[PDB]
């Protein structure tokens, strides 16, 4: 076992799991889900004594809410069995335990509803509504909604009740930023886009509205059920180990077409 030395002792035997997922979405103008997947990693940070037999249990459905892995690679320390149990003697400190992909039953934490109105050929009226879709006790953090503007843009007027927004002319986008937002809510932004005149013939190819966010759950639906520690020499049971998990779900590509 060349990934863990043999001397290791801690009074405080503790581990931390980070489930880190990036959720990706392409949505049609009329709310259809054109494409969506999650990529995830589980990172383990183990401060455990001796050489212990860890067993990682999740809400895998092949084994309540239960979920569907398309595929995954593991860290060499993992004993490949097909009971679908995850067994290993972990390296010390921090390492990547598994990497995975999911396409089915994904929680899309945000819904984006765009509305666009042409006003002659002098301006565009734009309304965008975002809906948080997740437990109300949970807050999303670091929410950005990026609304692209045409190249013939004289100037931009925006109102929003939540957040701050700026027209960023060099980037050709309005950028709305919200610090915090809770589950099962709505917010909207209105903007009026002043146009320059332009070659009437070439039309605007409206790129998507994209979002960034971070959420404290796994959009795949993954929940950690247990992490079991057995060290058969040393005199500490499983229930002596202090165990922690956190979830950090972040947008990848998360685009809604208008």
């Amino acid at each position: 076992i060349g990934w863990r030395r043999e001397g290791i002792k801690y009074r405080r035997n503790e581990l931390f799991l980070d489930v880190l997922e990036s959720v990706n979405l392409l949505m049609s103008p009329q709310g259809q889900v054109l494409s969506a997947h999650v990529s995830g990693r589980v990172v383990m940070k183990s401060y455990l004594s001796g050489m212990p037999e860890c067993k990682f249990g999740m809400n895998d459905k092949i084994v309540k809410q239960s979920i569907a892995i398309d595929d995954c690679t593991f860290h060499q320390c993992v004993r490949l069995s097909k009971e679908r149990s995850i067994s290993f003697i972990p390296p010390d400190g921090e390492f990547e335990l598994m990497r995975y992909r999911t396409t089915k039953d994904i929680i899309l934490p945000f819904r984006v509803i765009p509305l666009v109105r042409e006003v002659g050929r002098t301006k565009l009226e734009v309304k965008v509504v975002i809906k948080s879709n997740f437990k109300p006790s949970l807050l999303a953090q670091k929410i950005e909604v990026r609304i692209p503007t045409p190249l013939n843009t004289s100037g931009v007027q925006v109102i929003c009740m939540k957040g701050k927004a700026k027209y960023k002319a060099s980037e050709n986008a309005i950028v709305w930023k919200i610090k915090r937002m809770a589950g099962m809510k709505e917010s909207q932004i209105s903007a009026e886009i002043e146009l320059l005149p332009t070659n009437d013939k070439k039309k605007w190819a409206r790129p998507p509205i994209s979002m960034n966010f971070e959420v404290p759950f796994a959009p795949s639906g993954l929940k950690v059920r247990y992490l079991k520690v057995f060290e058969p020499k040393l005199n500490y049971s499983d229930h002596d180990v202090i165990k922690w998990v956190r979830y950090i779900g972040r947008s990848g590509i998360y685009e809604t077409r208008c």
Binding site: F16, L17, P216, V224, Y226, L227, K243, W244, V245, R246
Partner: peptide, 6 residues
């Protein structure tokens, strides 16, 4: 943000 595994 870290919670106990129950």
């Amino acid at each position: 943000q870290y919670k106990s595994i129950l």
